Amino acid sequence: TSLVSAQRLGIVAVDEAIPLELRSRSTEEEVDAVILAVYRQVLGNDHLMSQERLTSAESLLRGREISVRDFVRAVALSEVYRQKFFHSNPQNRFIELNYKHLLGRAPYDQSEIAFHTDLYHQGGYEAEINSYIDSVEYTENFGDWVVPYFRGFATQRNQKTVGFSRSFQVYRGYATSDRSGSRSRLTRELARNTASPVYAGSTAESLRGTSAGSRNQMYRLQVIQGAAGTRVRRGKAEYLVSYDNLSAKLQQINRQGDTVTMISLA
Amino acid sequence: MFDVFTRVVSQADARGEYLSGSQLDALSATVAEGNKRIDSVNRITGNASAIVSNAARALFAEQPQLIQPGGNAYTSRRMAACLRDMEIILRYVTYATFTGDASVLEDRCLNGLRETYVALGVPGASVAAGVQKMKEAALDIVNDPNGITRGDCSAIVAEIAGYFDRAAAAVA
Amino acid sequence: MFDVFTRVVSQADARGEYLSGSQLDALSATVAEGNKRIDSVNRITGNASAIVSNAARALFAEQPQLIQPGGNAYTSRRMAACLRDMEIILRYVTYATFTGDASVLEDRCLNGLRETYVALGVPGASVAAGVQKMKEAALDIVNDPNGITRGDCSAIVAEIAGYFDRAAAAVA
Amino acid sequence: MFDVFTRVVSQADARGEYLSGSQLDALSATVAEGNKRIDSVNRITGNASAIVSNAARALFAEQPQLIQPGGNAYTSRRMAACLRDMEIILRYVTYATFTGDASVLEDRCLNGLRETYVALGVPGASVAAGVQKMKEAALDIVNDPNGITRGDCSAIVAEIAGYFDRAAAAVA
Amino acid sequence: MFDVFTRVVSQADARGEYLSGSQLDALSATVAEGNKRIDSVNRITGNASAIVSNAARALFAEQPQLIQPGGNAYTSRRMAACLRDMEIILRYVTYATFTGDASVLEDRCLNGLRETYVALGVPGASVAAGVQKMKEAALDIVNDPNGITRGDCSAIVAEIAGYFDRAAAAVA
Amino acid sequence: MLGQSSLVGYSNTQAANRVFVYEVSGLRQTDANENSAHDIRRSGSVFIKVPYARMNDEMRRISRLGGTIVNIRPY
Amino acid sequence: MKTPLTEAVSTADSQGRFLSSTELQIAFGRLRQANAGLQAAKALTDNAQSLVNGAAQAVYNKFPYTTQTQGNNFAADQRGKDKCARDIGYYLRIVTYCLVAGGTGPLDEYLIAGIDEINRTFDLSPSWYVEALKYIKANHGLSGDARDEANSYLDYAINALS
Amino acid sequence: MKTPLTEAVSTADSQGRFLSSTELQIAFGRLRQANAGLQAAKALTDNAQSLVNGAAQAVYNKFPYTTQTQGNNFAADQRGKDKCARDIGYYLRIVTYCLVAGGTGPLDEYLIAGIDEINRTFDLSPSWYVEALKYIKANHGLSGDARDEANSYLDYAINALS
Amino acid sequence: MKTPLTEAVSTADSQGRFLSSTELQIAFGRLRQANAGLQAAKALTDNAQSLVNGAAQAVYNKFPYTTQTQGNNFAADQRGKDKCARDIGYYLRIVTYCLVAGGTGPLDEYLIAGIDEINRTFDLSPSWYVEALKYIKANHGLSGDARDEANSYLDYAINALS
């Protein structure tokens, strides 16, 4: 996005990122950069140990035996990708990680969760992974030679608006990674076809003045509430409380049976 | 909120200019329509309980899954909440008719209602169906030619229908 | 890709030897010529749209069969692709002038271009004629004496002409 | 891809000419024959499974070496691939019938199919035999006079036969 | 991929016949040699780095032109690639020994290696010599009677020698 | 000519353990790839190594993009 | 090219599906529109020269500076007038193609795609072509479905230009 | 290679852009540094043999065990000393290449990439070459811009080794 | 946005590398250019109003129709003239920003990206702004490196417009 929203949302680096294309007759440093970019983006910005590198796959990329898309497929199908994204993750978290790593976006619909779940159940992890890489979306966005990059913060054709908001649920910052078993943040949002407020970068913080407590810290409690007291006017509720009253807010939320969806520092 | 006069006033103040002759004449036309507007508000208010109860009965007859055990209108608390929601929609529609502007209905009743219904599992489409039933009953009440000074109420009926359709769209 | 320094560096590493004094002195004369190289690059870049559009206009005035219906430059998509190709060739020629080596022009632009144009039915001879027109415009823009520190720029002009003829030979 | 209309359009654009009166009248006769074309497409897609299954069974009956162990149609995976190809050829023939042009069939189904079968060891001659069995079954289905407004459908049947022979000649 | 069992399974399925008594007895004899095969695989794996490094050092001791500047093994990246390739060939030889069948080594490492090395300018003869040195080191290490149950490992050593021959003949 | 090790995946099946070389020509700007973020660099003969299990997808892609499959070679 | 028949087949093919009743309804709509589209094209091509000349004259009248300003992009001389008449004829012919085909496919394939780089590169203002297309709208004399479809194509070109 | 002109062209080409004032400033910085780099390379070349022998001797002094421990990776015999001197000459020659090219491109291309697999495989300690490069940086005797560039390349190699 | 320092850092970061002598040479080129760029920005700022007014008048002179044809996109009335002067001032101010920043980054971020569909939607002819930029080129009265850099930005805008 433009700078004025970019600094607020903490997505400046994504906006200024330039797609990396492996051209013909590329030098050694260009193949090195492509391999590094693929490892960074497909493995979700983990510190990749040299013992986890795909030496044969990157040799085939180096000798121009395979394309960038093929190397991306090899990294995605590799046991390293399985270990850190599949074997200890729920299926819905796993496929949103696949959407982030392979297509550079957040899931748009619950039907996309129904797809890749049935696809896994029929054809295994390999068929499920190949669905993303062989998709029309991957072809039109990246082709055979462009390293996949995150696209959820930019307006795409055939995109739902919610994706942009949901993008902030799968991209938590430039210095973040998809390393830690974890549950998807988008489960209820996808199932009920909703959107959640974006609290990313500096958007989550709120004014304090003298209303914050001793340590000048406010907390935002996003809860789902119903009538169990006073009249409830909305199903969604947001409470801004100081640290000193946080426990009290939690307990009164708890004794009314309201479910806490998110708690963040504001 | 706004009424019919203050909406035009707020637009003029943002533009920082006096209301033109055309805007003053349009508000005069609204003033001429005012007696029929009060009539429509009074007729809907006078038949509010019947409108809500009849629409709810029709809705539950055509959507039995609402009242079957496990349905979102099953149990007494949820049935009371459903009847309360129908009454609230009707009341804020009457508010919008009275003011001549849709701000009260939107700001105080419709805004956030869809997310409330989705968050608690209330089927918004069924609420929309109940709103259409209340719409048809209320418009029959307003257009009743018995016991009233005969005149053309098509404009106010269309405005009320628009408020009802805004409610039915907002819920689903 | 290589530049002017890395070309001799790669040759020396393959031979396994330190650059000789003569090679270092030649790279010093290149450093001395670097200011005129930057001026040539800047002048071609600043008139790139004019060069491409005027050369294209000349290439369609004579050789009108390109823009006749059924011709390869007919329809907006193909015409835009042709203009883009001329701009791409000019841009890579500026890249080669900037680096002082033609490796960028060969590896990134001219590699497979003849096979491409053959597989599309693009008349590569006409592309070569357009490249010659861009060459003549670019050379007379580079050799413009006004608004610049006077000096002999014959060597850099010969290098730019060599890059342009190299592109024209590749497409022909 | 081209339909019956866009094919003439593309030829006219290549020539820089408006469609002549004769071409417009020919495309008018084509529109006049559109109901029969739609009904033939519907008849084939309504009996697609029977066409594919009967053609495959007849093919294995007269070419038992396909289904013997070691044959290309042996094992469940290869049999499913064989039936899948049968169905794909039938579907793209229906596409060609629907559009009125063979562009979809040549560009999306027969593009590289012969050397696909060559590189896999698939006996493309037997594929052509199966395609002829589909052809006779589908032409009998299209020409069935029961339960339909009677008329002469010889032209559309000849076009469908031409699409089938196209596919069979491509795979042979 | 094939192992010693699935290979004969594939021939029998192609012929559509059950495995005869002779084939089952041969497989039983293979099973009786399984402990020796596992020992050979383990010994090569436990000495893989030593085998590759000693063979590479000997391969550069003779044939010095590989490591002189301009040679194929010169520069760190190409030396690392050479070492990597020797280790990869040894790893696939161990895979072939483990499975009892040469399919993994042929399909994943050997087939197409001579053409890749020719199109890179890699000397096939020198890498074949390196494969021979890895052969001799690995065969000495496997045929080490210390610290293991005594027996006749001639058959497994012959199989390993055949795999090493395959990779030397396929790479040259 | 390499690649088989990484192209075939992990089906392990004999049917998937085959790769093929596609020769494609005439990859131009069509209405099908109007919104392609990347640009076509070559329209002449390009060679794509496709495993068996993806041969259905790739040729469709080729057939969708106007590319002409001129030859397919066993690897 | 985008047309009801080709679009229906492409949608069915992307899903790997046979042509269902939905595709048949698409073909039925194409048949319902095709005759009127063909007569629209026939009427436009019979009066093509006068329409193109009048559109060029209208562009010259609304933008008189194109008649007297010296420049490669202007119609001051005969060469510029021929280029302008040729461009307007291209627009009219491709619109007739769209009427024949039943979709904006010929316009997208032949004219719309890349027209921005052409108008910018050769310094041709799209407002001139907008006025030419408006003249064609106001003087094609079509009625009914032929008018509706022809004007849909002409406004498609205008919206693409503006 | 990682040189300023090639990097400038690479980043401009990755965006499909003509060279702008940013790339021209990159070339100006390259021109400002290039002559100093050329005299740095000449001085290193003229004193290459003595620098290589002194660095090898310095390694033998700091690590005396390499002088008298038997093994292929050690310089106990004449062959080990020849290999060590050849390696140090490689380091110095590629540093001169970096000075000529104006970037760490030659070091990355020829020496840095894959050096640690080599050192692990042939059981060669990178500390030997680090102290040798330290000797080169201490005794090459350059000044100013030439010294700063040469020290940057030697420190780049040292940091890669450690 | 595109400046020598930020792109050097972004290219180095995408490669996971420290800043090497290449990026240092980039900074040296930026320092060599920066004083001239700053004094060009000062000279353009002081004479900004005269340059903007003269550029608007030059556009009106070469395109007289813009001064008497009624319409939202023209400058026949005071509102159009105010919009036109504001646009030309936007161009001049962003060019001064580019001179300060040392690259076309301000032009790309603020003006160049999305200028074409703006010019298209509001029916604004890019040739008008090209003539304004040509007047600014001919009347800024700069010399040496300041002129060269400023003209590079002005004709970068011209090339983007044409």
Ligand SMILES: *[C@@H](C)[C@H]1/C(=C/c2[nH]c(/C=C3N=C(/C=C4\NC(=O)C(CC)=C4C)C(C)=C\3CCC(=O)O)c(CCC(=O)O)c2C)NC(=O)[C@@H]1C
């Ligand atoms: C459409 C809404 C129907 C309709 C309305 C209508 N009403 C009037 C006029 C009047 N109605 C009132 C109302 C009230 N007087 C009271 O004391 C109260 C209770 C507090 C109410 C609600 C009044 C005062 C008038 C004016 C005097 C009169 O009765 O005539 C009209 C006449 C026009 C006017 O606007 O004054 C009309 C048309 N008529 C229909 O036919 C619709 C079914």
Ligand SMILES: *[C@H](C)[C@H]1/C(=C/c2[nH]c(/C=C3N=C(/C=C4\NC(=O)C(CC)=C4C)C(C)=C\3CCC(=O)O)c(CCC(=O)O)c2C)NC(=O)[C@@H]1C
């Ligand atoms: C114009 C009336 C107002 C305005 C608009 C504005 N919007 C954005 C950015 C985005 N707009 C969207 C919306 C969509 N994208 C889609 O694909 C769809 C359809 C499914 C919608 C509705 C999105 C997602 C973005 C962000 C991503 C992107 O910009 O591509 C901006 C830019 C904000 C920035 O800082 O860059 C603007 C300016 N702004 C106003 O002031 C008007 C009132």
Ligand SMILES: *[C@H](C)[C@H]1/C(=C/c2[nH]c(/C=C3N=C(/C=C4\NC(=O)C(CC)=C4C)C(C)=C\3CCC(=O)O)c(CCC(=O)O)c2C)NC(=O)[C@@H]1C
């Ligand atoms: C060392 C001083 C302390 C420490 C560190 C530690 N960090 C991680 C994991 C990660 N570190 C990062 C940080 C970055 N990655 C980037 O790309 C950027 C640049 C913008 C930054 C700053 C990330 C994202 C991770 C996530 C995991 C990953 O592998 O990348 C770990 C690993 C934790 C684990 O393995 O579970 C550790 C150990 N730990 C200490 O005890 C020191 C105080």
Ligand SMILES: *[C@H](C)[C@H]1/C(=C/c2[nH]c(/C=C3N=C(/C=C4\NC(=O)C(CC)=C4C)C(C)=C\3CCC(=O)O)c(CCC(=O)O)c2C)NC(=O)[C@@H]1C
């Ligand atoms: C060492 C004994 C000889 C030698 C080797 C050498 N090889 C290459 C380059 C490649 N080697 C391969 C082979 C494979 N890669 C794999 O993943 C597998 C398993 C499927 C194999 C068999 C490939 C593909 C390449 C190219 C890619 C790459 O360079 O890594 C080189 C480098 C060649 C170059 O850099 O141009 C070298 C040096 N060289 C000798 O002199 C020895 C005889």
Ligand SMILES: *[C@H](C)[C@H]1/C(=C/c2[nH]c(/C=C3N=C(/C=C4\NC(=O)C(CC)=C4C)C(C)=C\3CCC(=O)O)c(CCC(=O)O)c2C)NC(=O)[C@@H]1C
């Ligand atoms: C009846 C047609 C449908 C139905 C209704 C239903 N609604 C709720 C719960 C709530 N309804 C609201 C709405 C409002 N409250 C307000 O104060 C306002 C006006 C300012 C509105 C519009 C809210 C906020 C809730 C939640 C709090 C509450 O429970 O009162 C329920 C209860 C759901 C539950 O299980 O808690 C129900 C049953 N249900 C149907 O099935 C009908 C289609």
Ligand SMILES: *[C@H](C)[C@H]1/C(=C/c2[nH]c(/C=C3N=C(/C=C4\NC(=O)C(CC)=C4C)C(C)=C\3CCC(=O)O)c(CCC(=O)O)c2C)NC(=O)[C@@H]1C
């Ligand atoms: C113009 C002077 C002549 C002309 C040109 C023309 N070219 C194409 C199509 C392509 N041109 C290229 C070339 C490149 N693309 C790049 O990215 C680069 C760098 C590697 C180059 C050199 C390519 C690949 C194509 C095809 C794909 C694409 O268009 O992007 C066309 C279009 C052909 C068609 O049928 O679409 C045309 C018209 N034609 C003439 O008549 C002039 C003589």
Ligand SMILES: *[C@H](C)[C@H]1/C(=C/c2[nH]c(/C=C3N=C(/C=C4\NC(=O)C(CC)=C4C)C(C)=C\3CCC(=O)O)c(CCC(=O)O)c2C)NC(=O)[C@@H]1C
């Ligand atoms: C059946 C009548 C005959 C037969 C068929 C057979 N075909 C294959 C394999 C493939 N067939 C195709 C063709 C297509 N795939 C598509 O998606 C389309 C439309 C674009 C077509 C036309 C392809 C590409 C393959 C290979 C890829 C794949 O199967 O997924 C086989 C399998 C061959 C094998 O050994 O694996 C078979 C058996 N075989 C006969 O014997 C019959 C005469």
Ligand SMILES: *[C@H](C)[C@H]1/C(=C/c2[nH]c(/C=C3N=C(/C=C4\NC(=O)C(CC)=C4C)C(C)=C\3CCC(=O)O)c(CCC(=O)O)c2C)NC(=O)[C@@H]1C
């Ligand atoms: C030709 C091979 C056979 C044949 C065809 C035939 N059909 C018609 C006319 C019509 N057929 C239809 C078709 C459909 N109506 C639907 O609702 C659907 C399902 C979505 C379909 C497929 C229609 C609409 C017509 C026109 C109305 C009518 O029923 O008459 C004709 C008559 C001529 C014409 O083209 O209209 C003919 C000849 N008749 C045969 O004998 C062949 C076996």
Ligand SMILES: *[C@H](C)[C@H]1/C(=C/c2[nH]c(/C=C3N=C(/C=C4\NC(=O)C(CC)=C4C)C(C)=C\3CCC(=O)O)c(CCC(=O)O)c2C)NC(=O)[C@@H]1C
């Ligand atoms: C007429 C409305 C105004 C006008 C016309 C004019 N046009 C050009 C040049 C070109 N026009 C086109 C347009 C097309 N060619 C196509 O293939 C199609 C799509 C099928 C279109 C719409 C093109 C491509 C050019 C440039 C190449 C060529 O000359 O053919 C000129 C000449 C401009 C120049 O620089 O030579 C002119 C004069 N100008 C006016 O003043 C009229 C108001």
Ligand SMILES: *[C@H](C)[C@H]1/C(=C/c2[nH]c(/C=C3N=C(/C=C4\NC(=O)C(CC)=C4C)C(C)=C\3CCC(=O)O)c(CCC(=O)O)c2C)NC(=O)[C@@H]1C
């Ligand atoms: C000297 C500081 C110490 C030392 C050196 C020593 N090195 C080797 C062997 C090799 N050195 C290299 C290094 C390179 N080759 C290149 O092409 C480049 C880049 C241009 C470099 C840096 C390599 C690859 C080898 C192994 C292959 C070869 O023999 O050339 C040895 C011999 C190791 C062996 O097993 O024979 C030695 C002795 N030894 C000392 O004791 C010094 C302290």
Ligand SMILES: *[C@H](C)[C@H]1/C(=C/c2[nH]c(/C=C3N=C(/C=C4\NC(=O)C(CC)=C4C)C(C)=C\3CCC(=O)O)c(CCC(=O)O)c2C)NC(=O)[C@@H]1C
């Ligand atoms: C002056 C050369 C000619 C002219 C000008 C004119 N421009 C507009 C309208 C707009 N100008 C812009 C441009 C920008 N906005 C920005 O933020 C920047 C980047 C920093 C630029 C370059 C825009 C966006 C508009 C439209 C919105 C707005 O009005 O501000 C108009 C008015 C058009 C309208 O319909 O309102 C005019 C008159 N007119 C002439 O005749 C001159 C030859």
Ligand SMILES: *[C@H](C)[C@H]1/C(=C/c2[nH]c(/C=C3N=C(/C=C4\NC(=O)C(CC)=C4C)C(C)=C\3CCC(=O)O)c(CCC(=O)O)c2C)NC(=O)[C@@H]1C
């Ligand atoms: C050669 C084709 C033509 C020519 C060129 C020429 N230029 C110089 C000297 C300089 N040119 C520059 C360039 C720039 N300074 C900037 O700020 C910008 C934008 C980034 C540019 C492009 C500089 C810095 C110099 C040095 C100082 C000076 O102003 O002179 C020369 C002189 C010799 C030299 O190599 O420096 C020459 C010859 N002169 C002609 O007559 C040709 C037409």
